[PDB]
Amino acid sequence: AVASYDYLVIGGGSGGLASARRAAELGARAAVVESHKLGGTCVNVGCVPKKVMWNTAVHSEFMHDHADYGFPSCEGKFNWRVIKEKRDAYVSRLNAIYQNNLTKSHIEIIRGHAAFTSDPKPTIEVSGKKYTAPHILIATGGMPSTPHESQIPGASLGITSDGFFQLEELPGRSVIVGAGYIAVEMAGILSALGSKTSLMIRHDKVLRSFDSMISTNCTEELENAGVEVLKFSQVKEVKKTLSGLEVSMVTAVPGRLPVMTMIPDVDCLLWAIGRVPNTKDLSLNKLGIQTDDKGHIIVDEFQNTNVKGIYAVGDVCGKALLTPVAIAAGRKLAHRLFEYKEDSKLDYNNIPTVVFSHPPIGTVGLTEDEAIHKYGIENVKTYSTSFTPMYHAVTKRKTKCVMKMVCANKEEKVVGIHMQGLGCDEMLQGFAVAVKMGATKADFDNTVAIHPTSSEELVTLR
Amino acid sequence: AVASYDYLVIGGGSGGLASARRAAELGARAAVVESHKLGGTCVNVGCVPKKVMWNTAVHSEFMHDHADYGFPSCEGKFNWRVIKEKRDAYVSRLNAIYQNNLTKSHIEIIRGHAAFTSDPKPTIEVSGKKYTAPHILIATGGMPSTPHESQIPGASLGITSDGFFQLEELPGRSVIVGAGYIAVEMAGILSALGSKTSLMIRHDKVLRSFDSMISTNCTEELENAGVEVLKFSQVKEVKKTLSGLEVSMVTAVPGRLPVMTMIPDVDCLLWAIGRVPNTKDLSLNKLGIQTDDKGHIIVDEFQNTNVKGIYAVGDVCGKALLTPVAIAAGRKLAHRLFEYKEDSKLDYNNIPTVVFSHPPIGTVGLTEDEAIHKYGIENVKTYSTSFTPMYHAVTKRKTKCVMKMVCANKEEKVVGIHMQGLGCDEMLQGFAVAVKMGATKADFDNTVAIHPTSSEELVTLR
Ligand SMILES: Cc1cc2nc3c(=O)[nH]c(=O)nc-3n(C[C@H](O)[C@H](O)[C@H](O)COP(=O)(O)OP(=O)(O)OC[C@H]3O[C@@H](n4cnc5c(N)ncnc54)[C@H](O)[C@@H]3O)c2cc1C
């Protein structure tokens, strides 16, 4: 027997939840399949617990300033277990909320692991029961990458971001491998909270896909906060020792000779080297659904797979791996399918990003170099500033704020905004709305500043 | 003898500095007259020292959360003298910077008090020396209002915001009189830093000129932080006592009878009841320059006075009493006069405001009621939310975030944004650029959210 629905969603994370909820608002008879915990990566091992830990780190960093602001110093050690328990309770509250959001919307929850069957009409099986719909969304997300043993013997002795959220104590000594935003965020949290932390990167700077100003500044800020940035460095082997692990590293700086270094007494080795899509056990081959060589589901601009009636959104597709992107793509898809809006799709240009470094980073649009490639060097003008926020006027510890505006053509259309500094996490959203609207530099300069803030610096560049 | 300039600016605060510096860039031979300290109210007794004290208060409030975030509590008393000295040093650094900005621009600094003379050609005298120009800008600012003794005997025993910045110790007991932003900010700082604080207001709520949602929320947040809000209350008399002052108050709540209350043992009585323009000793009558009954210089939309070749900007005109407004009006005036741009003027609509309450307030555009008056009730739609920021997921202390979007007509043009919450101080600027550009609700909803932030709530209202 086969149960039929209007909409079957595989995965109860950001993209699947949002798409199912919007489809149900439009009248669809929907079901969500979930093998683990509702909320997916965002709620359980991603956005939310990361942010709680960032808030904890931020608090610690600021308290380094308590005597400078007139208070007796706070000479106190952090207790990781206290915040771990509170973080876990919050996650549990969210799991309950998202379950209720589906129930209240009359969306069926199917608990178990879905795979496709060979039925020519697309059908899935979950725990030996079959389900079909004219519309099936694959929203199964991804998972952290780990090196293979054949490449890096002992790599399984390391953990990933998933294991980070299972830690019950602060590691004394941490080595984070990677140079992307997850690596940066994890290193900054562990160091702020008192771990002796190193960040191992393949080149000279972190965040190399970001604007050059951000890549440079973020690297410098990491070092100024006490993160040891191990440049031009790669892990060759990991061994268990009486104390933690020993990491064998090769460093090969341009202009120097390669050198092997052992890093002893490592408590936490964290691989933050990429993400792999969760498609291996879906039985995609039974329907000929197209993937790349990494396992990502291939889609068009409307989130269609190569198979009629099958769609994919979110991290499983490998493009713009953010919660709001999964959500927006899922909602736009629901309006296309169930409101019949044939042009409903997500625009992947001008998606804003925040990285929860110390201080945070915000970016939207094109890097300076991307704009030069697109528009021509003679047709791009940048404006930038660097300053110390007035929060630090009275402190011995310092952080900087850097801002860059990238403008194109005679009208100076704002095609990119890039910044790092106190407040940049909350500052970016509104600027992203202006950029999406096609703001020019004149539109910024025509807006009266708010004083005293960091944000006014973006409307007073000259 | 009379020295001639292209541009004479009376007052070296925000408006005068900015206008003189822009005129000099355009080639004007300019001079600034200043009787006290360069930087005016902004640097010396306003924006900057207020913000330092807000940062100090904010730090204190957050440290109330230190144990909840896993650290041993910070059981420590504040030392006002520590931050007072650091604040004063910062002010001195700024005085030196603005002096240098004028010198580097080849702007003459004339030290002393200016007044007009009776010369038919507009001329000023400073320390017995006369100066003239075809263009004279009056940018003399204002000062705090204090009640007259004939109205409130003993009112001179109180202080104003000026005296707040001279305090050398934390008052044990403070009573702040007023219901506008300065009163709110001063009460919140004094209470956060440990003073037993009352805020005395004439009606039921603070910030009555702001959107109703903000007025309500700000009042509630003050009370939840421990500020005693004395509603429907007015000072009748002040007397010196062996301990501080005794404030005689009359309270007259609608539906109840009036009652007299003595408030004993008050260390600081702070009048925050308004601002008066600094025009009494300018000898404006010698040239027939027009003022209102409160002393404000009357201007047109181009900052012209009623006398050819004489202009006014900033607080002396009584409209939109903010530093960036003075600056922008002064710069626009310089382009009009010295670049010959006859349409160069400041648009006073859609000026954004932040109030440094706890948490901060941001607003731009029309209140809901102003929009209903302008557009008609049937043509205004509001969207709002209220939530607890995730910073407080792990804390026993709570603050709320409230947000309101005011939309007009079928297209839902965003004509007002109003919020209070963590981050709102840095969040508003970019939204103000969108509003100034004529954003509609669709423009907001077309912008991809940034997660997890408070700011995303403004682009996901339904
Ligand atoms: C450490 C970390 C920090 C991050 N920080 C941020 C950030 O600050 N902001 C941001 O916007 N993004 C951030 N992200 C990215 C964001 O979490 C992801 O982009 C988003 O969760 C992806 O949503 P999704 O719906 O594609 O997949 P997921 O949320 O991963 O959901 C997929 C769901 O499918 C389920 N599932 C998988 N296969 C099956 C199957 N066959 N049958 C049934 N169920 C199945 C899984 O159990 C899971 O619940 C972060 C991620 C990580 C790991």
Ligand SMILES: Cc1cc2nc3c(=O)[nH]c(=O)nc-3n(C[C@H](O)[C@H](O)[C@H](O)COP(=O)(O)OP(=O)(O)OC[C@H]3O[C@@H](n4cnc5c(N)ncnc54)[C@H](O)[C@@H]3O)c2cc1C
């Ligand atoms: C407590 C407080 C907090 C504030 N908070 C903020 C805030 O957070 N953000 C914001 O944008 N605004 C804030 N403001 C308002 C802002 O400070 C003022 O709007 C701005 O300083 C006004 O600038 P101005 O140039 O008009 O006048 P002023 O800065 O007052 O400058 C006038 C100058 O003229 C000089 N002067 C006066 N008469 C003469 C004379 N005849 N001859 C020579 N010199 C003379 C004075 O000494 C002074 O230096 C605050 C103000 C106060 C008091």
Ligand SMILES: *SC[C@H](NC(=O)CC[C@H](N)C(=O)O)C(=O)NCC(=O)O
């Ligand atoms: S961490 C869980 C995610 N929540 C959000 O990203 C907030 C979404 C906004 N409230 C919005 O866009 O409405 C999530 O996965 N949400 C799925 C959902 O259905 O909201």
Ligand SMILES: *SC[C@H](NC(=O)CC[C@H](N)C(=O)O)C(=O)NCC(=O)O
């Ligand atoms: S508190 C002194 C004031 N500074 C600002 O308001 C910052 C101004 C911005 N940097 C800008 O608009 O450029 C001030 O009074 N400034 C006068 C000046 O000439 O900047």
